[PDB]
């Protein structure tokens, strides 16, 4: 696999979380579509609140935005001794560590350079400080890289013409490029990407208020739906390919996704049209055997009893699971950051883990 | 078939339309959910202009207010001679006639007065009157009786259990109890019905705004969703069976209604869940072969980039059908006022047409 194009050619957005100047720079998404702005944060308790806010939002980037959190507070200590800046540190990474503790790639962030700084406790201070700098970029890079790969992959196995997403899976639900997002944005740059369908997706509109508002910022061509209308567009031949992200893949290759992944899937299979999950490597978590082992988060029914600002149903019971499962057989292929795999996915995961 | 209730014993709301004491009552639908309120029209030009506000909706409530709005004429006319009388009913014929120029049941019901009245014109004044006055009430009765018998054929078909349906066919979408209405009301007294799924049905949100409301008042048990939800519910076994209302059945029973449906049809294929349409005998056009012959109308892109009252999204092309066309193999069977009609829909339902 050959990477063709670099982080500028694919997108014009800067970085999703940023750090320069020992501050830390974040795309307030909170502000998005209406607004589009970058916020700079100079302290960790604000970077700590612009996790919780969800200003960020997107594992890579709630991530990134921890680790950048650490390297702002080796960079900004008044600690003299190295006894008080380690005091201190734990101090920022408890701080950090209780944003969402639902989210995971936060946990792993902070534990990643948790360890790299118990590891070289003896080192110098003005030393240890360069090493959490540096593997809070690492952590972020990291991230954009493997969104490279996935593009690249996923450019190879899609076909030309037009696809169809779901919720958010651009560039603002990771570092840099997304992993949905840099598939298409491969696609458009190479011109196999005639037209991307949005589905808005219910009930947190991620789809209309993120997805359509990155995609356009490109100038990839984009047409917004509402959820019930994936089916009749599929019904009418006006989609070749679909791609969703996924939040978990587990062994048999079953995955969770936000709410709707579900209905394309089986809706997919209904007009033969080829339906592909993308993620990197570390969404897949080899521990479970099945999707009935991923547990189901249902969330406040005020997101579906309102809608934007305003409310739109009289005060009745509501069904709020924010993300499906879908069983592996609907899966055409998965992407990945270190190649595609096809089925059988439970031997071919298992393989792909055995090779890295 | 035996009808073993009637209105008052099914459903706790007034006719969506009524006629009494020479005025117009209809619930106002544009102030649901937050409020309810009947609202009280005593002259033809406000009767035509709640037809255009969309104070009233629904094909047969529709046709029912602008049937009474000629009755309101007939009644309030200042007329002294038959010659005055008949042309001032042609002008309010008219006025109602330039509402919504296309709701079909409108044109129908104006058109049966017209009729009526032209057939009748060497009657005398209070003669003529009556006849209209009469015939605004068999038009209004009659969509609640054909209701009344749906909703005891569809109880018969449909299992006990938990049910499933899609956007607004109650009694806000006819004069009285509605067709989908008629059916869950009628298994709601009966005790067969232990839960109704409701799919909020994006653009419009008639699902959430309509649909659980007035399932509301009437203490049925309910669960709004996000219509991205309805395959998630479907493959946890937790519906036992979809109806749905449909607005216009062809030969062989292909059928379009509110975008989404075609969707459901689909998904309970999947899960060999059993799919129902039900409507008025009036609702199947003969003169129509297969669903490819019914036109798709599109709808403001305002539908989709709001919701409720909110702007959601950045200004990008948008797809906005509103109805999908479901082909005949979807559906289970069809329930209409005159019984239910079994594949193959296209011969059942030609007899079904002799026999009447």
New interface residues.
């Given amino acids: 696999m050959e990477i063709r194009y670099t982080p500028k050619e694919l997108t014009k957005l800067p970085r999703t979380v940023e750090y320069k100047n020992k501050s830390v720079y974040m795309i307030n998404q909170r502000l998005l579509?209406?607004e589009f702005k970058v916020e700079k944060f100079s302290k960790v308790e604000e970077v700590a609140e612009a996790i919780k806010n969800m200003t960020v939002r997107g594992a890579p980037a709630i991530g990134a935005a921890a680790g950048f959190g650490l390297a702002l507070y080796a960079e900004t200590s008044k600690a003299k001794t190295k006894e008080e800046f380690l005091d201190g540190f734990e101090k920022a990474y408890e701080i950090l560590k209780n944003t969402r503790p639902t989210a995971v790639n936060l946990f792993w962030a902070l534990n990643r350079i948790k360890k790299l700084v118990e590891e070289h406790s003896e080192d110098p201070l003005d030393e240890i400080k360069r090493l959490i700098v540096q593997e809070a970029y690492k952590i972020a890079d990291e991230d954009v890289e493997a969104n490279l790969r996935m593009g690249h992959y996923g450019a190879e196995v899609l076909p030309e013409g037009n696809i169809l997403t779901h919720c958010n899976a651009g560039s603002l639900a990771t570092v840099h490029l997304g992993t949905v997002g840099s598939v298409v944005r491969v696609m458009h740059k190479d011109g196999s990407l005639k037209l991307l369908?949005l589905?808005?997706?219910?009930?947190v509109?991620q789809g209309?208020?993120l997805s359509?508002?990155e995609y356009?910022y490109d100038g990839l061509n984009?047409?917004?739906?509402?959820?019930?209308?994936?089916?009749?567009?599929m019904?009418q031949g006006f989609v070749d390919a679909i791609i969703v992200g996924a939040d978990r893949i587990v062994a048999n290759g079953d995955f969770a996704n936000k709410?709707?992944t579900?209905?394309l899937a089986?809706?997919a299979?209904?007009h033969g049209i080829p339906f592909f999950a993308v993620a990197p490597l570390s969404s897949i978590d080899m521990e479970l055997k099945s999707g009935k082992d991923i547990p189901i988060e249902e969330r406040s029914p005020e997101e579906?009893?309102?809608?934007?600002?305003?409310?739109?149903?009289?005060d009745?019971?509501?069904?709020?699971?924010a993300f499906?499962?879908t069983p592996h057989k609907y899966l055409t292929g998965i992407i990945t950051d270190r190649g595609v795999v096809w089925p059988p996915f439970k031997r071919n995961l298992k393989k792909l883990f055995e090779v890295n």
Same sequence: chains 1, 2.
Wanted: glycine residues 6%; charged residues 20%.
């Fill in positions: 579509p209406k369908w589905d808005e997706t219910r009930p509109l209309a208020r359509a508002w356009s984009v047409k917004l739906i509402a959820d019930n209308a994936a089916a009749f567009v019904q709410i709707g579900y209905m089986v809706l299979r209904e579906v009893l309102t809608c934007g600002g305003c409310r739109i149903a009289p009745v019971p509501v069904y709020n699971p499906d499962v």
